[PDB]
Symmetry: C4
Subunit: 392 residues, 4 copies
């Protein structure tokens, strides 16, 4: 974690060069008072790439490492050959490359891109204000006022607002302004594109659920389905949103490898499976096969799970909801079942008519094992199969 301090220090040093270099290009006086800071930052930049190689597309580091400054401000070079101090502003490409990889997971990449673009735009605005100040007529005005005027002009130009109170007066000013207008239009377009991209991907799951509900409702409208069934479907979809944001269990768990899927299935269904009379005293591999073949099914309130008198072929394990066991005529409540329990266990060993009616109080979200998968998997574990056959 010691490299984060070095990265932050390098960011501070490059922001220092970004602010001072154009400012001292405009004002050559500011070179002796900030000399020790310049020397210290030059050493830091020289030593950075040794520390970049240790504990790990490269020209920017070499070009910003060597001190092309400290000589143009010492020998007092002319304007054409004084702009070679800005090669040290190529460190930003590397600072941004480091920042986009030491924060690619905690922060949304679109937001990181937008923030980096905003910072680059502010630095470029400072540089453009310095360039505008340089190519101005010499007048006796305070330096702060002349900076606040150049910065006001460049912010007015970059935002495409264009008040017009500060305008070009010389042909060189006009050419510079044309260039700055082009870059300002490009940068504002980039900002708008970044914002539009950031906003498009915000509510993806809500929009997907809304489109699914609209498509289902339109299809049921075509098939002339009664309003009661549509109301039940809309209440289901709403409950799905308020519980799992409209996500089916089967599609989420196909995004995982076999060991992780097995671990999740065990952590969900272990005690509930283990505490079954039929399967107690059986091995762990048989339990794993069952724990891997349970199919999620959500039953709405008042829906029929098992009806009295039907043949029946499935067993159900309650995971979240509640259930009422009732008579054939639905006059007497045998029992109320909650989490951790099960019903329909007397169907994996006999194919007899069912013994009661099962109804749902609220949304159930229970798992189900069919007798076909159970018989399929029972072929490879004959000991249990014998116990089941004797039980029958």
């Amino acid at each position: 974690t010691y490299t984060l301090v070095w990265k932050v220090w390098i960011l501070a040093v490059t922001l220092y060069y970004a602010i001072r270099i154009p400012l001292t290009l405009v004002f050559p006086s500011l070179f002796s008072p900030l000399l020790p800071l310049d020397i210290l930052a030059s050493l830091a930049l020289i030593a950075d790439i040794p520390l970049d190689l240790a504990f790990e597309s490269r020209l920017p580091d070499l070009l910003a490492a060597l001190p092309l400054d400290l000589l143009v401000f010492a020998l007092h070079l002319p304007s054409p050959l004084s702009l070679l101090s800005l090669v040290r502003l190529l460190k930003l490409i590397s600072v941004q490359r480091s920042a986009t990889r030491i924060l690619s997971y905690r922060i949304n990449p679109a937001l990181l891109r937008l923030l980096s673009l905003v910072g680059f735009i502010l630095l470029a605005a400072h540089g453009i204000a310095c360039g505008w100040m340089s190519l101005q007529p010499p007048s006796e005005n305070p330096a702060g006022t002349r900076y606040l005027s150049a910065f006001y002009w460049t912010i007015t130009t970059l935002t495409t607002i264009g008040y017009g109170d500060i305008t070009p007066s010389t042909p060189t000013q006009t050419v510079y302004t044309i260039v700055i207008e082009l870059l300002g239009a490009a940068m504002y377009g980039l900002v708008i594109g970044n914002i539009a991209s950031l906003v498009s991907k915000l509510d993806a799951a809500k929009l997907l659920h809304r489109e699914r509900v609209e498509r289902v409702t339109a299809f049921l409208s075509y098939k002339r389905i009664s309003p009661e069934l549509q109301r039940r479907i809309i209440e289901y979809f709403d409950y799905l949103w308020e519980t799992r944001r409209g996500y089916e269990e089967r599609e989420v768990l196909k995004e995982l490898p076999h060991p992780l899927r097995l671990a999740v299935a065990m952590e969900i269904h272990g005690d509930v499976i283990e505490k079954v009379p039929l399967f107690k005293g059986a091995g762990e591999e048989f339990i794993r096969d069952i724990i891997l073949h349970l199919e999620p099914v959500i039953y709405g309130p008042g829906e029929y799970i098992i009806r009295a008198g039907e043949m029946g072929s499935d067993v159900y394990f309650i995971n979240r909801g509640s259930v009422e066991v009732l008579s054939a005529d639905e006059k007497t409540r045998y029992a109320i079942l909650s989490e951790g329990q099960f019903f329909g266990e007397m169907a994996l060993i006999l194919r007899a008519p069912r013994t009661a009616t099962v109804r749902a109080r609220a949304f159930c979200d229970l798992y189900r094992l069919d007798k076909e998968t159970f018989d399929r998997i029972l072929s490879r574990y004959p000991e249990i199969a014998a116990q089941i056959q004797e039980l029958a």
Copy 2:
């Protein structure tokens, strides 16, 4: 439904503070005439969070609850310590959080976001106009004219229009204007991004259908398909758009749980299945299996459904279209079949050559059951199987 009145009242109170607080910051005279309303709103805000806890990320409520105003306007504090009345404008974060959850289902979330952004932008424009009025030279002008001028300046700045008739004159005005230009560019970019996001998701189904038609047409172009077949396909796809917006039945009904899917299938196919000679007097579970295994198929106008003399293995139930039964030589019309009827019933009990030719008048949209699924499911209901075998 009593909480909606309270939410609307809280919205009105916070819009009141949003309008009055900056206005009375600019004009300290407006504090006695609106004193009872201020007291009443202060009580409402104090009592709101007791009513927020009952019948249900929290600091904004506490910071807006306490009256940091009513003292800066009573003791006549100076400008640095007079801006502590605006902490009560943090209630907007909670009003927006309530609005985005008491209307997340009726309104498109993108539209709600755009409307909330527009309201926030108007409130911010009022506040920025007040701030611009505050840092103006003292002159004897009517208050309404000075507000209409500050509001004109801030609307001109926020929209990036920039007429330039009203411009900064002092360094403080220049700094304030630079800040306002930056926020105006950000807010306009946000508005444009919201509008682009809202417009991109408008005609999703039409675009999907258009891309499917284009891909199919291009693929048939590669395979050099005759124009008649392409014309038939385009007429089919068009009928699919004018009926179900280009949606396949099988993919729509996989978006539903087993009980809801069973209910929809029963409500679609119940009387049509029930009134079959072969299956009358059979149980409800057998009917449910058939009602669950019917496969949708749309036949175009003039298409062959059953041809005379073929072996044949399927039965068809008419759902929407019309049919003409015709001779082997297609000279005599045996019958015309409409909704609620069926044909090909003498194929689930014998594998004999067919007895007539079936043609479609218009698009049919009929269901079909194959003899393989029927035989598969007949294994678990032997009583019916015996009746079928004796019938054969």
Copy 3:
């Protein structure tokens, strides 16, 4: 096709009212010279809704049908009660609703939306210019110059350019300008959103193919695949783009119903299947099953289709490419096969070692039938099965 003329005439009439009504509101002189056109358009609008009901959300038609004009310009009503002539500009909602449904299939809906927005923006600019002219000081200037000035001001405002040479002078002008600035920002944001939506969906297939190629190349990079195989894959993907725009046959034909799929398969494979020694003299249903079970497979240049000495279980039908039959040692060319021919026919009746080597000159794009599907489908047609068994 007579309704298109009526729709175009209604569009012309409503564009006439859109241009004349605000213009004659500004200039009350222009009411007698254009009186017959106004009467004729009023009759046309009165009679339109009788013709809207015949040969087929309704208030706009009734509100634009009755002549609320022809009285405000006849009795010379004052300004508050003179703006009731613009209710007849609600016909645009219906003209646009008709246009978006009589051209929803020929034109891209995004382009139609953009064009409708542009037309509405131009009409609104004309109306806003008229409103700006109305609330101007009375001066003796030519009407054309005053219109060209109001239109210049409104175009400068709506585009967010804001030259500033024409600016408000009165409080009413300032309020009107604030409103127009808000609507101009909204309309420009709408235009930008429409353009971004139109441009995002332009090159969908090319982008999908590019992402597939990038993903495949990156995955092969991880697995350290030799450059020759990567080059072969890239040449394949390129050929897929230059032939079918990167579309797999199997996914395109699952977008069609069973009769259309059968018709396409017959039109592709009919003569090629029919002219097979093994299957000649067989029925049409057997041919249909084969024509429905042929699987597309593209072989690259120089690839092995059948190798000498392998067991072999498949038959291949050439559809587009060319093939070279060669010896076990690949020294002698037995034959060259083109479209309409086949090879490997002596594998659906015996499971013997193969008799030659098959190589591809260029990309083949040939179909393949396995012996498993052939045996599966041969169970239900025993006569052919007997002929095959005797042939073996």
Copy 4:
């Protein structure tokens, strides 16, 4: 590769006409000094379409081929009939059509579209500046200053900045400015839409992986999974990003035809399969079937692959990771397995209890063959089946 030189030369010639034609329209003096270049470019354009037909929607070529210039500048035609020299600027449509097909694969098409739009915008700005210069009052000013002023005005207008220092003065200037404002708004909207489209599709894979991780984490949050399992899943997903950018092997290899899939599978698994005691001396087709039926599975660090005492039905081939073979009580390390080796080979010939415990050091990324697929495919190769049965 000789056509690229001709295309570049044609691009240079059309950029020459784009710059000179409006410039010599404004300044009729510049027609004799550049006469030989004009003649040479006219010959080049005349000869281009012969070379367009050889070594290969056409009107632009014919309209730009004939010299409608060289006569309006020779006979000194008036202004209405002097604007017929610009028909030769229709060559740009063909230059762009050539550029969008000789670089559709190396360059992102969105970037190519943006660059072409930028170039067209710069050329249009030059033309608009020339048009603005033409309709200016005659004054004695240097030509360069008048161009730099017209270009400054058109760049200020096109970027929607609108300083306002240069404004219309005549009605013709006002109409021209209104037109230019409309085209500038359209072009800036097009640029913003292009940038937004380019930025939306940048980090597609990272966003897909982020959404998968968010959905999985939310679903596990609903099911109340312990933090240890969630931490293991997040470490897995992270390793998947740092290795294959979040791509599953099975979905990537379904994007390839059977020969390419077979070649990739052979190049991945060949030596590892070949060096197996059970399968040595067997044929190549049997090896191909195995090499086609190996299923990828990634095991995390510390995960159980084979547990001592279980029945066991699978064999594993190590591809990338490392493995530790351990005792039933996990006290003694039998061996450490690296790339190119395998374990569990004594399960495809007997269904005996396993003989050791297999654990993963780091992420493994190993392949697995089940005994069901092996038995399925062993039916069609009886010789090996006999060798396996005798081995058992």
